Amino acid sequence: SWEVGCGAPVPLVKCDENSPYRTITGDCNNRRSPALGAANRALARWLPAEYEDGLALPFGWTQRKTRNGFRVPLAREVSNKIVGYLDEEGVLDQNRSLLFMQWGQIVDHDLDFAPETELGSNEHSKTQCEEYCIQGDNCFPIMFPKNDPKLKTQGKCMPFFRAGFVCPTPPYQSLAREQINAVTSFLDASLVYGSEPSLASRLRNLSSPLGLMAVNQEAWDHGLAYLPFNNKKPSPCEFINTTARVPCFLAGDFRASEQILLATAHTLLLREHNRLARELKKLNPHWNGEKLYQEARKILGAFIQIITFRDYLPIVLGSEMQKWIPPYQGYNNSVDPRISNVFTFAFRFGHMEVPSTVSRLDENYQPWGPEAELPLHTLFFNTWRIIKDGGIDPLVRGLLAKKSKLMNQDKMVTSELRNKLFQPTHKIHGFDLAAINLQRCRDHGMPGYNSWRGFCGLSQPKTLKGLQTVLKNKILAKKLMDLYKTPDNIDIWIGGNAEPMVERGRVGPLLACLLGRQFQQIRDGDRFWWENPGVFTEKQRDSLQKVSFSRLICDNTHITKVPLHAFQANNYPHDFVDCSTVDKLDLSPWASREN
Ligand code: HEM
Ligand SMILES: *[C@@H]1O[C@H](CO)[C@@H](O[C@@H]2O[C@H](CO)[C@@H](O)[C@H](O)[C@H]2NC(C)=O)[C@H](O)[C@H]1NC(C)=O
Ligand SMILES: *[C@@H]1O[C@H](CO)[C@@H](O)[C@H](O)[C@H]1NC(C)=O
Ligand SMILES: *[C@@H]1O[C@H](CO)[C@@H](O)[C@H](O)[C@H]1NC(C)=O
Ligand SMILES: *[C@@H]1O[C@H](CO)[C@@H](O)[C@H](O)[C@H]1NC(C)=O
Ligand SMILES: [Ca+2]
Ligand SMILES: [K+]
Ligand SMILES: [K+]
Ligand SMILES: [Zn+2]
Numbered sequence: 001s002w003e004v005g006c007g008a009p010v011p012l013v014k015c016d017e018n019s020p021y022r023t024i025t026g027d028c029n030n031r032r033s034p035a036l037g038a039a040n041r042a043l044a045r046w047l048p049a050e051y052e053d054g055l056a057l058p059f060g061w062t063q064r065k066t067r068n069g070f071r072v073p074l075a076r077e078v079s080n081k082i083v084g085y086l087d088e089e090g091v092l093d094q095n096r097s098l099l100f101m102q103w104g105q106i107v108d109h110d111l112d113f114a115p116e117t118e119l120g121s122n123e124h125s126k127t128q129c130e131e132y133c134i135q136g137d138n139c140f141p142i143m144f145p146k147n148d149p150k151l152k153t154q155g156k157c158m159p160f161f162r163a164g165f166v167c168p169t170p171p172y173q174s175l176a177r178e179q180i181n182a183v184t185s186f187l188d189a190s191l192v193y194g195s196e197p198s199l200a201s202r203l204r205n206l207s208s209p210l211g212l213m214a215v216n217q218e219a220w221d222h223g224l225a226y227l228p229f230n231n232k233k234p235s236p237c238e239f240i241n242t243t244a245r246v247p248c249f250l251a252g253d254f255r256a257s258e259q260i261l262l263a264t265a266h267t268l269l270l271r272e273h274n275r276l277a278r279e280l281k282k283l284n285p286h287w288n289g290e291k292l293y294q295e296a297r298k299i300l301g302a303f304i305q306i307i308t309f310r311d312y313l314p315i316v317l318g319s320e321m322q323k324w325i326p327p328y329q330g331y332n333n334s335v336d337p338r339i340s341n342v343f344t345f346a347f348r349f350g351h352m353e354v355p356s357t358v359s360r361l362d363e364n365y366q367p368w369g370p371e372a373e374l375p376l377h378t379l380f381f382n383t384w385r386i387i388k389d390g391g392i393d394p395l396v397r398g399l400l401a402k403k404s405k406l407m408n409q410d411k412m413v414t415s416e417l418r419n420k421l422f423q424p425t426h427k428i429h430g431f432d433l434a435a436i437n438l439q440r441c442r443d444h445g446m447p448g449y450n451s452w453r454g455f456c457g458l459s460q461p462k463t464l465k466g467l468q469t470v471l472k473n474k475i476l477a478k479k480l481m482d483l484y485k486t487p488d489n490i491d492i493w494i495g496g497n498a499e500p501m502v503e504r505g506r507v508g509p510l511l512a513c514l515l516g517r518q519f520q521q522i523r524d525g526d527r528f529w530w531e532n533p534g535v536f537t538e539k540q541r542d543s544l545q546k547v548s549f550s551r552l553i554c555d556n557t558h559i560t561k562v563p564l565h566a567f568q569a570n571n572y573p574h575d576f577v578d579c580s581t582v583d584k585l586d587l588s589p590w591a592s593r594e595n
Helices: 075-083 098-111 125-130 149-153 197-202 260-283 289-324 343-352 393-401 433-443 449-455 464-471 474-484 492-498 509-524 538-544 549-556
Strands: 092-097 357-359 373-375 403-405 429-431
Touching: 075 433, 075 474, 075 492, 092 098, 092 393, 098 260, 098 289, 098 343, 098 393, 098 403, 260 289, 260 393, 260 549, 289 509, 289 538, 289 549, 343 433, 343 492, 343 509, 357 393, 429 433, 433 492, 449 492, 449 509, 464 474, 474 492, 492 509
Parallel strands: none
Antiparallel strands: 092 403, 357 373
């Protein structure tokens, strides 16, 4: 039996098929298979799921059951031994701005989201997990190893809930557990507009026929818009400062307020949509709000597509860019547009690019007041520092003039993320992203490192000397072998990130292959790809080729000096030009005359 039966919690719809606009859900992109790429379906499997019991139990569940006759090391143990480091001196990427890091998380959030199992909506199951560290059902807690400082200070574990899976009521037959992607697999600005019709409607300005996205009515950034507040309570953004009591933002994506630079980016994108809609109302005063919303949405979509493929991927993939993403040859309806389970771990390379501090800079790119530089951990679920402390302009200057962290085999993930992460359900700056990433690899039935090396046509190291040669690093290979005993058991997230970077890139070979193939598919398999003939006119495409992140800032802030190349390391003033010398988006080719 072959089964494409099971996928229950989804909006059902007849496909228009002649619409010039994407659906919100991602449905109807592929005409032969309308649900391919749509939200709230299984992540694609490039390799079959690997579970302790072949169905659903992750490796490390049953203390006793081995992986290939070896115990899997505790997620927190791998983190402590390998992923941690003390000295932030010298850690920064000398040719990547903070914008590099930040764009990664933006693209990631557009493509995939595997939300944790709910069921704990006013729940004692939450209690049995957080308080008593009791493994069972969806509680798969991260146990602290012996000697862990957090033993003395937090408890025996970090609580952890397993990712949502298709059929919370399956098809009754007997298959491996498959995690849901709650967002559209297409690069379509879903993190702005929503992947769900109901939310997408609530986000819109339906009071005026002007195709605008709803803006905050309680607060402004010197006349420029903020996202509306999420009024769902209790609010983690209120909790981190109950005096200020500034809630999280309401965005097309649940995660928009996770950290202040991500919230900033979401603000930049919402502003660009409203500016697009107003400029298109000027050109085409006969266009209704629906037409305005879709045409702006359609441009903003291509903008993300263009920045990602022209500016971002080449400086991630380096020498491997052309190998995996050759020049476009048009829409191929046989290409799987869906995001793979493994992709959602490969792209978490970004967690090694986040540095320990965030700066606010003034109009001369100097420290903005006495508390300019803040530790990252103070900025998780932090909206009050935007609303109540200078708006987004000072944070955007930091995005341009400050640097991403470089991935370092000895300095992988800053303590701000490894020890002081805040989760929106919980009350402590006490969680470990690197431990959560390793736990999540097991939750999702990820094959091992050598499985993936194999998939990518790379040598599979089986011995100490073998791993040393792949990693070009004797000590890291050793620490790995002592923890995992065989490279076969190395969880894909630490495995891929352990590899030294390709020439001119910021990931190693295994990650370049996994990311390369996914981005080749998200392009080739996308009927509404901006370069697909008929999606835009040839002239609209000439206009679009001129977009830049620098211009988005010029058009949606009060910053007047910006670099030409916003992703490379730029110092003020040598590398900054006045905004008037930056190419604009010419919207004249969107003019629509009935005569
Ligand atoms: C301060 C910066 C960042 C924070 C605080 C952060 C935090 C998180 C958290 C809490 C998760 C969920 C982990 C789980 O339950 O499995 C996550 C997932 C993920 N992150 Fe990050 N992250 C950051 C930056 C980045 C960057 C720069 C990228 C890529 C360049 C990235 C890519 C991902 C991906 C792919 C996932 C899995 C899907 C998802 O985003 O939910 N993250 N991140
Ligand atoms: C929806 O759109 C309307 C019209 O563009 C917005 O109303 C304007 O808001 C600005 C700033 O608050 C005022 O200076 C204008 O005078 C307003 N016009 C009217 C007719 O009131 C409105 O705020 C938008 N709604 C939301 C929730 O974003
Ligand atoms: C930074 O990297 C970009 C990547 O394309 C390159 O164009 C630029 O010349 C590099 N500058 C350096 C290493 O100083
Ligand atoms: C909370 O915000 C107020 C301003 O609203 C500020 O003066 C204070 O330092 C903040 N407290 C914390 C805990 O961040
Ligand atoms: C389209 O993709 C399929 C599946 O990857 C491949 O076999 C085929 O050769 C491609 N067709 C064209 C015209 O590129
Ligand atoms: Ca999407
Ligand atoms: K997979
Ligand atoms: K994320
Ligand atoms: Zn201003």
